[PDB]
Design a protein around this ligand. Structure first.
Ligand SMILES: *[C@@H]1O[C@H](CO)[C@@H](O[C@@H]2O[C@H](CO)[C@@H](O)[C@H](O)[C@H]2NC(C)=O)[C@H](O)[C@H]1NC(C)=O
Ligand SMILES: *[C@@H]1O[C@H](CO)[C@@H](O[C@@H]2O[C@H](CO)[C@@H](O)[C@H](O)[C@H]2NC(C)=O)[C@H](O)[C@H]1NC(C)=O
Ligand SMILES: *[C@@H]1O[C@H](CO)[C@@H](O[C@@H]2O[C@H](CO)[C@@H](O)[C@H](O)[C@H]2NC(C)=O)[C@H](O)[C@H]1NC(C)=O
Ligand SMILES: *[C@@H]1O[C@H](CO)[C@@H](O[C@@H]2O[C@H](CO)[C@@H](O)[C@H](O)[C@H]2NC(C)=O)[C@H](O)[C@H]1NC(C)=O
Ligand SMILES: *[C@@H]1O[C@H](CO)[C@@H](O[C@@H]2O[C@H](CO)[C@@H](O)[C@H](O)[C@H]2NC(C)=O)[C@H](O)[C@H]1NC(C)=O
Ligand SMILES: *[C@@H]1O[C@H](CO)[C@@H](O[C@@H]2O[C@H](CO)[C@@H](O)[C@H](O)[C@H]2NC(C)=O)[C@H](O)[C@H]1NC(C)=O
Ligand SMILES: *[C@@H]1O[C@H](CO)[C@@H](O[C@@H]2O[C@H](CO)[C@@H](O)[C@H](O)[C@H]2NC(C)=O)[C@H](O)[C@H]1NC(C)=O
Ligand SMILES: *[C@@H]1O[C@H](CO)[C@@H](O[C@@H]2O[C@H](CO)[C@@H](O)[C@H](O)[C@H]2NC(C)=O)[C@H](O)[C@H]1NC(C)=O
Ligand SMILES: *[C@@H]1O[C@H](CO)[C@@H](O)[C@H](O)[C@H]1NC(C)=O
Ligand SMILES: *[C@@H]1O[C@H](CO)[C@@H](O)[C@H](O)[C@H]1NC(C)=O
Ligand SMILES: *[C@@H]1O[C@H](CO)[C@@H](O)[C@H](O)[C@H]1NC(C)=O
Ligand SMILES: *[C@@H]1O[C@H](CO)[C@@H](O)[C@H](O)[C@H]1NC(C)=O
Ligand SMILES: *[C@@H]1O[C@H](CO)[C@@H](O)[C@H](O)[C@H]1NC(C)=O
Ligand SMILES: *[C@@H]1O[C@H](CO)[C@@H](O)[C@H](O)[C@H]1NC(C)=O
Ligand SMILES: *[C@@H]1O[C@H](CO)[C@@H](O)[C@H](O)[C@H]1NC(C)=O
Ligand SMILES: *[C@@H]1O[C@H](CO)[C@@H](O)[C@H](O)[C@H]1NC(C)=O
Ligand SMILES: *[C@@H]1O[C@H](CO)[C@@H](O)[C@H](O)[C@H]1NC(C)=O
Ligand SMILES: *[C@@H]1O[C@H](CO)[C@@H](O)[C@H](O)[C@H]1NC(C)=O
Lengths: 137, 139, 139, 137, 139, 137
């Protein structure tokens, strides 16, 4: 007889990042039970200066390495870090950033924003899974 | 016989397989399921043998990825997705159980296409072939 | 049974094999021929589904290379060539057909050395070994 | 009984590049049925200035991505693009360029030239095959 | 049958196996020993054919690494070492000889942990499983 | 019955580098039968200037490629080259260099030095093996 089974990935909440999608313009990636990054499609600019300091960010040594390792590997495959916060935006190059964003999830939008947030029970229908980050790694 | 708990299944409590079926996870490298077993085992070892993590370990998982999982199969599934063919989502798996006896089969993952899980009618050939495989395995 | 047409063969029209023979292309990863089958299938799928290409799809092939072909075998053949040993050219393939019955074998690519397709005697022993395989396949 | 079969790679004319050799000093790579690159060993200089601009070429947006992706991946593993044409030269570093050229084909020469040409039935004996590009890629 | 000389063994002079046992080094890719055989073969071919090495050939080995060895297994062993599990050092191997007849088995490497070679008591399960494997192979 | 065997890697003295350790603060990598590099831990600085030249070293052409190819690979995964000698200093970034050094061998120290030396029967208990360089490569 045929039988089916579904896997719950929230037992990998440590030692592996998890990610799930909520709306066609929002994505969420989680590290631990307290911190995550928001991947948001918007028509509103958050920063104006065209300078993205990243070496000074790691040289600051007042940050969380796990939080921005994901954004570093996203960059490999402008910014504003004043005060210790995390805020990255990509404006529309567009093909690559949208392809990476779709690689997470497995138009006429102006900005894609990566920002720090606290964990909430965000994603509605898609259960969390670590496959996207394994693929983009 | 490797066994799965209620914390790593949805709607199920205890569901597990013979060790002889799990033995195929180090011989054939075209199976979508054994990667999840490797991830689960690595997670258990990491949470047991390493205590009080300093806010998550990123390099350790970064390097276990190169040593545990199959990157080619992941790229194959991605290419299928971007090209409108049924692919695998790494979240749903089907198998055969043979309820009269108990001998089971290694799960093959469900095929997802167009955001809908295609039913047993559109891949019944795989079911028949695997049933024939267990029929041969009966001898 | 996978079959080869007259547009992908030179001097031949319809020369094709049984499915049970092609079944070895997803179990053993030392065969030089299955890469060509994978490339042909990818080409057929690409020209069929993705319609009206805009001056070639360089990224599609760039990403399918990582998913379909064996880069280690290509590098092995290249290293063998630069070090002056009979290697493979990816253009000539020999096999057995057993004309009395029809059952055939998966081709192994020809051995090229010094810009000359070395003759059947120089590797005849291999032939015999494969014959023994069909002997083991006689039962 | 033993039989031999040979494969015609021109069925991969689209969706895969093809390459074949004509003489020891000439090589051809072909994309589609109208465009290709000539790889020529020569002792004649075509351009003088010692500056190769490649970022400006992609920023021009009046080009063909398929043509120069191959030369990009060749560079990874001086130039003159004025008017939209493609012309790259390597003057004689020698070991690497000759090794790459021999890798495609699978001294007393001063230059190797990469240039744009229209398809012709060039290569005499060597049938086209995509293994060279799969190796370089 | 591949035979090991006295220059590549310590405390031994001639110790070698049937070719049928060595036949598993191109089928199963979970073996820790066959990489050493491939390195020995590459070394013999390099010192035989290529003559008068001018201060070593660094690129030749840099490109033979990508074609001959299994980087995933090396990284697996390194992860085990940095995660405090018995691992392999690529220097000690244990096999069975069956001294009554002479038929042997492909060596599996020793398990090194905490700078000490754990004795036969701590991995006797593998010994029993392999003995059962030869028992099945008797038929 | 059960029998064990040990492999002598010194048959690979040519065509493959061999590495074997002597003390916790010393490592030795060997090319050929005459030349090798010392990887040493010390509390004494040997150079003062904070400028490491590597492109000039390869452009010098009066050097040995095999010796500094290994150090190039080590760099990828200050300096002082005057006179043709080899001397690389890493002062204590620490996590990466110690991890690479431990990878070869398979605290409260100040500097790690890579230097040229002549072959001697250095390593006391650890027999030579090429697995370290295969890992670093
Ligand atoms: C999907 O859900 C998101 C989140 O609710 C919507 O994005 C906006 O979210 C903010 C709260 O952070 C609300 O105040 C807005 O009303 C939401 N909408 C807009 C247009 O800003 C989003 O609209 C939803 N739908 C889509 C298609 O993304
Ligand atoms: C974000 O701004 C863009 C502006 O570029 C909006 O895109 C426009 O959408 C309308 C109707 O959907 C079209 O008539 C315009 O031609 C579009 N402008 C383009 C393509 O440049 C987009 O709808 C905005 N998104 C939201 C959620 O308001
Ligand atoms: C994301 O991380 C940054 C960096 O810590 C947070 O920014 C500061 O967080 C501390 C800790 O709560 C606050 O005391 C500061 O007031 C924050 N800075 C500012 C300018 O508000 C940021 O709050 C985090 N994101 C969220 C949603 O909490
Ligand atoms: C290989 O073929 C090319 C193409 O014909 C030869 O190149 C020609 O060389 C002569 C000089 O001997 C020129 O006059 C022609 O114009 C060249 N043809 C071109 C540029 O299309 C080449 O000589 C042949 N042999 C070798 C060894 O390359
Ligand atoms: C391009 O330059 C090379 C030299 O780098 C020429 O090769 C020389 O040709 C002359 C002909 O008289 C020989 O005497 C030399 O022995 C060759 N080698 C060297 C190193 O000089 C080559 O011929 C030149 N190209 C052409 C078309 O003449
Ligand atoms: C290779 O491509 C370049 C870029 O288009 C061609 O250069 C121009 O091509 C157009 C189209 O035929 C001509 O109208 C121009 O006159 C060309 N430029 C110059 C300076 O002549 C180039 O012709 C192509 N190569 C070949 C052999 O056709
Ligand atoms: C390991 O062996 C080395 C090599 O003998 C020792 O290094 C010596 O250290 C003493 C004390 O500083 C020096 O006087 C010697 O000159 C050093 N030897 C050489 C060859 O330079 C080292 O002390 C030993 N122990 C450790 C823990 O490294
Ligand atoms: C490591 O290599 C360098 C570069 O050749 C050596 O430095 C010179 O070696 C020659 C050969 O004996 C000597 O004649 C020079 O006097 C050396 N230069 C200096 C500044 O001393 C270096 O000696 C080599 N290392 C060892 C231990 O011999
Ligand atoms: C990004 O968006 C547009 C370019 O498309 C531009 O107006 C805006 O200033 C840019 N901002 C940054 C920070 O690059
Ligand atoms: C970094 O921040 C400084 C301070 O405003 C600014 O002058 C510089 O342009 C920034 N650079 C980058 C790359 O963000
Ligand atoms: C197969 O059916 C038996 C019936 O009792 C059940 O106990 C077992 O869990 C089933 N197999 C799986 C893998 O769930
Ligand atoms: C084997 O021989 C038969 C005889 O008719 C022929 O039809 C068949 O095509 C041959 N096989 C191949 C692979 O050519
Ligand atoms: C290339 O060739 C030689 C260098 O060996 C030199 O004479 C010539 O000017 C160089 N030209 C360019 C454009 O680099
Ligand atoms: C393009 O190359 C020319 C060569 O003469 C050079 O003068 C010019 O500065 C270059 N443009 C760039 C690098 O943007
Ligand atoms: C097994 O024992 C026999 C007894 O003579 C010996 O010849 C043979 O070498 C042994 N096998 C190995 C692998 O050493
Ligand atoms: C190379 O050495 C010179 C001589 O002091 C120095 O000026 C220069 O900065 C050095 N270059 C590097 C890259 O260290
Ligand atoms: C290296 O060590 C320290 C930096 O931690 C510093 O005192 C010393 O001058 C440095 N020297 C060089 C050459 O970088
Ligand atoms: C080197 O200096 C450090 C100072 O932090 C000291 O702890 C260490 O013991 C010194 N090394 C030796 C060999 O004395």
């Amino acid at each position: 007889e045929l039988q089916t089974l579904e896997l719950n990935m929230e037992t990998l909440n440590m030692t592996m990042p998890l990610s799930c999608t909520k709306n066609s313009s929002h994505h969420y990636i989680r590290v631990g039970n307290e911190t995550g990054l928001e991947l948001t499609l918007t028509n509103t600019s958050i920063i104006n200066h065209k300078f993205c300091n990243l070496s000074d960010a790691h040289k600051k040594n007042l940050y969380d390495h796990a939080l921005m390792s994901i954004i570093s590997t996203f960059h490999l495959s402008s910014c504003d870090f004043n005060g210790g916060k995390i805020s990255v935006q990509y404006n529309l190059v567009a093909n690559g950033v949208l392809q990476t964003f779709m690689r997470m999830a497995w138009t006429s939008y102006q900005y894609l924003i990566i920002q720090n947030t606290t964990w909430e029970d965000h994603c509605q229908f898609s259960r969390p899974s670590p496959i996207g980050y394994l693929g983009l790694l | 016989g490797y066994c799965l708990t209620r914390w790593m299944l949805i709607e199920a409590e205890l569901k597990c397989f013979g060790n002889t079926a799990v033995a195929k996870c180090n011989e054939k490298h075209d199976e979508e399921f054994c990667d999840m077993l490797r991830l689960f085992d690595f997670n258990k070892q990491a949470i047991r043998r390493l205590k009080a993590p300093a806010q998550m370990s990123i390099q350790l998982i970064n390097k276990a990825v190169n040593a545990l999982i199959n990157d080619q199969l992941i790229m194959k599934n991605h290419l299928r997705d971007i090209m409108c063919i049924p692919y695998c989502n790494y979240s749903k798996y089907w198998y055969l159980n043979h309820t009269s006896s108990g001998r089971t089969s290694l799960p093959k993952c469900w095929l997802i296409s167009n955001g809908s899980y295609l039913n047993e009618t559109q891949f019944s050939d795989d079911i028949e072939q695997q049933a024939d495989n267990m029929i041969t395995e009966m001898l």
